Scaffold this active site. Structure first.
Site, PDB file in Angstrom:
ATOM      1  N   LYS B   9       0.839  -1.208   0.000  1.00  0.00           N
ATOM      2  CA  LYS B   9       0.000   0.000   0.000  1.00  0.00           C
ATOM      3  C   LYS B   9       0.869   1.251   0.000  1.00  0.00           C
ATOM      4  O   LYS B   9       2.078   1.175   0.190  1.00  0.00           O
ATOM      5  CB  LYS B   9      -0.939  -0.023   1.206  1.00  0.00           C
ATOM      6  CG  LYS B   9      -1.846  -1.274   1.215  1.00  0.00           C
ATOM      7  CD  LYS B   9      -2.695  -1.371   2.499  1.00  0.00           C
ATOM      8  CE  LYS B   9      -3.981  -2.163   2.274  1.00  0.00           C
ATOM      9  NZ  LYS B   9      -4.747  -2.274   3.564  1.00  0.00           N
ATOM     10  N   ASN B 112      -1.749  -0.075   7.325  1.00  0.00           N
ATOM     11  CA  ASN B 112      -1.255  -1.408   7.645  1.00  0.00           C
ATOM     12  C   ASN B 112      -0.484  -2.047   6.489  1.00  0.00           C
ATOM     13  O   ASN B 112      -0.440  -3.279   6.385  1.00  0.00           O
ATOM     14  CB  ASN B 112      -2.405  -2.302   8.124  1.00  0.00           C
ATOM     15  CG  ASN B 112      -3.445  -2.597   7.033  1.00  0.00           C
ATOM     16  OD1 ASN B 112      -3.322  -2.163   5.892  1.00  0.00           O
ATOM     17  ND2 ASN B 112      -4.471  -3.369   7.395  1.00  0.00           N
ATOM     18  N   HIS B 115      -1.715  -5.494   1.421  1.00  0.00           N
ATOM     19  CA  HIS B 115      -2.967  -6.205   1.204  1.00  0.00           C
ATOM     20  C   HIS B 115      -2.664  -7.624   0.750  1.00  0.00           C
ATOM     21  O   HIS B 115      -1.710  -7.851   0.002  1.00  0.00           O
ATOM     22  CB  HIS B 115      -3.835  -5.523   0.132  1.00  0.00           C
ATOM     23  CG  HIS B 115      -4.954  -6.389  -0.372  1.00  0.00           C
ATOM     24  ND1 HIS B 115      -6.237  -6.318   0.132  1.00  0.00           N
ATOM     25  CD2 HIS B 115      -4.975  -7.363  -1.317  1.00  0.00           C
ATOM     26  CE1 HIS B 115      -7.002  -7.197  -0.493  1.00  0.00           C
ATOM     27  NE2 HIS B 115      -6.259  -7.851  -1.370  1.00  0.00           N
ATOM     28  N   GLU B 126      -8.865 -11.059  -7.826  1.00  0.00           N
ATOM     29  CA  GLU B 126      -7.965  -9.906  -7.707  1.00  0.00           C
ATOM     30  C   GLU B 126      -6.807  -9.987  -8.698  1.00  0.00           C
ATOM     31  O   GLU B 126      -6.445  -8.983  -9.321  1.00  0.00           O
ATOM     32  CB  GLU B 126      -7.434  -9.787  -6.269  1.00  0.00           C
ATOM     33  CG  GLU B 126      -8.517  -9.376  -5.274  1.00  0.00           C
ATOM     34  CD  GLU B 126      -8.140  -9.577  -3.807  1.00  0.00           C
ATOM     35  OE1 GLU B 126      -7.001  -9.998  -3.503  1.00  0.00           O
ATOM     36  OE2 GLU B 126      -9.010  -9.308  -2.953  1.00  0.00           O
TER      37      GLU B 126
HETATM   38  N1  LIG Z   1     -12.230   0.450  10.660  1.00  0.00           N
HETATM   39  C1  LIG Z   1     -11.393   0.844   9.669  1.00  0.00           C
HETATM   40  N2  LIG Z   1     -10.942   2.120   9.548  1.00  0.00           N
HETATM   41  C2  LIG Z   1     -10.107   2.501   8.556  1.00  0.00           C
HETATM   42  N3  LIG Z   1      -9.665   1.642   7.609  1.00  0.00           N
HETATM   43  C3  LIG Z   1     -10.035   0.329   7.611  1.00  0.00           C
HETATM   44  C4  LIG Z   1     -10.943  -0.147   8.669  1.00  0.00           C
HETATM   45  N4  LIG Z   1     -11.154  -1.462   8.450  1.00  0.00           N
HETATM   46  C5  LIG Z   1     -10.447  -1.815   7.345  1.00  0.00           C
HETATM   47  N5  LIG Z   1      -9.780  -0.744   6.841  1.00  0.00           N
HETATM   48  C6  LIG Z   1      -8.897  -0.767   5.640  1.00  0.00           C
HETATM   49  O1  LIG Z   1      -9.531  -1.470   4.567  1.00  0.00           O
HETATM   50  C7  LIG Z   1      -8.890  -2.720   4.307  1.00  0.00           C
HETATM   51  C8  LIG Z   1     -10.013  -3.732   4.201  1.00  0.00           C
HETATM   52  O2  LIG Z   1      -9.495  -5.047   4.143  1.00  0.00           O
HETATM   53  P1  LIG Z   1     -10.299  -6.274   4.838  1.00  0.00           P
HETATM   54  O3  LIG Z   1     -10.658  -7.286   3.759  1.00  0.00           O
HETATM   55  O4  LIG Z   1     -11.367  -5.753   5.780  1.00  0.00           O
HETATM   56  O5  LIG Z   1      -9.131  -6.927   5.763  1.00  0.00           O
HETATM   57  P2  LIG Z   1      -7.629  -7.249   5.231  1.00  0.00           P
HETATM   58  O6  LIG Z   1      -7.062  -5.929   4.748  1.00  0.00           O
HETATM   59  O7  LIG Z   1      -6.908  -7.781   6.454  1.00  0.00           O
HETATM   60  O8  LIG Z   1      -7.852  -8.262   4.129  1.00  0.00           O
HETATM   61  C9  LIG Z   1      -7.909  -2.948   5.454  1.00  0.00           C
HETATM   62  O9  LIG Z   1      -6.724  -3.674   5.074  1.00  0.00           O
HETATM   63  C10 LIG Z   1      -7.629  -1.534   5.965  1.00  0.00           C
HETATM   64  O10 LIG Z   1      -6.523  -0.886   5.323  1.00  0.00           O
END
Ligand SMILES: Nc1ncnc2c1ncn2[C@@H]1O[C@H](COP(=O)(O)OP(=O)(O)O)[C@@H](O)[C@H]1O
Ligand SMILES: Nc1ncnc2c1ncn2[C@@H]1O[C@H](COP(=O)(O)OP(=O)(O)O)[C@@H](O)[C@H]1O
Lengths: 149, 149
Positions: B9, B112, B115, B126
């Site tokens: 990211k 974080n 992805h 994807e």
């Molecule tokens: N509550 C939140 N507030 C801000 N950003 C979020 C939140 N939840 C998820 N995100 C962002 O959106 C992405 C959504 O991915 P998700 O499928 O929910 O989990 P992962 O990223 O672990 O696969 C996350 O990696 C994160 O960067």
């Protein structure tokens, strides 16, 4: 904005050294602006190595460099061409110092893991040979005020 | 041939973690078969995150993920989707264990770093969204007989 062309060779891909090569440039503050994995064609490789076209090992080098995928990339930053050459180490691994890529990982000039531009003019030529301008990304590094004056 | 979609990211690019992410997969014997750096458009990002389109933070996520370059990539190998998820760590860094990417490098769910696909079906969707089939490289890893039965 000084830029250099770096390329992981088929043996660097096979041996799992792509991330290591990138990380050596990132840790020195250099900006990754382009990267891709591809099978390079013979014609592209012959142009890339055109300065060597008259040497005995030219066909073998070209055939070898097309025998598996490569990872071309572009880094940006102050003195990146000259520092790129030092970080890669001598062409012949036995002449390279420890701490350099070829000094740490290579035993054979014919399997020396990575390519890097040897001059500014060569860098500009190689970048434009492997990448269209639209593949080069522009951004400002947050650490810019702390990596150069 | 199991494959997963991994993507650094904008904050992972800015903080110089691209090579680190790649190297964690290479050290586990996984095969890099595609990679590029790009500015992702809003439309691509909205399709990528289509499952989240109804959530309050969706527009902010999309705007953030287009605010600097990203590095999409594809890895291949046995159980690569499930192991990819473990190696990245929990979505919320405070829930992730040390040794994982988010446990080692992240403090905020919204920053974080990386992805990764959460399932085989998601990976196939994807991969095909970000890469045309011609960008995926095929080769045989020399270490193949020593990384799986
Ligand atoms: N509550 C939140 N507030 C801000 N950003 C979020 C939140 N939840 C998820 N995100 C962002 O959106 C992405 C959504 O991915 P998700 O499928 O929910 O989990 P992962 O990223 O672990 O696969 C996350 O990696 C994160 O960067
Ligand atoms: N004597 C040789 N035998 C086999 N391969 C060679 C030989 N000399 C050079 N090569 C290959 O061709 C490449 C030519 O690059 P060159 O510009 O001479 O140096 P560098 O690779 O350090 O920039 C080398 O990196 C190496 O992989």
């Amino acid at each position: 904005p000084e830029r250099t062309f770096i390329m992981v060779k088929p043996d660097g891909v096979q041996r799992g050294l792509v991330g290591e090569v990138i990380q050596r440039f990132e840790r020195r503050g250099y900006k990754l602006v382009a990267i891709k994995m591809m099978h390079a064609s013979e014609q592209l490789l012959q142009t890339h190595y055109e300065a060597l076209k008259s040497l005995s090992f030219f066909p073998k080098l070209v055939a070898y460099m097309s025998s598996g995928p490569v990872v071309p990339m572009v880094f940006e930053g102050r003195k990146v061409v000259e520092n790129g050459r030092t970080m890669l180490g001598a062409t012949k691994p036995e002449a390279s110092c420890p701490g350099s890529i070829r000094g740490d990982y290579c035993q054979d000039v014919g399997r020396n893991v990575v390519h890097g531009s040897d001059s500014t003019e060569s860098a500009n030529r190689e970048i434009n040979l492997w990448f269209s301008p639209q593949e080069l990304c522009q951004y400002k590094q947050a650490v810019d005020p702390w990596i150069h004056e």
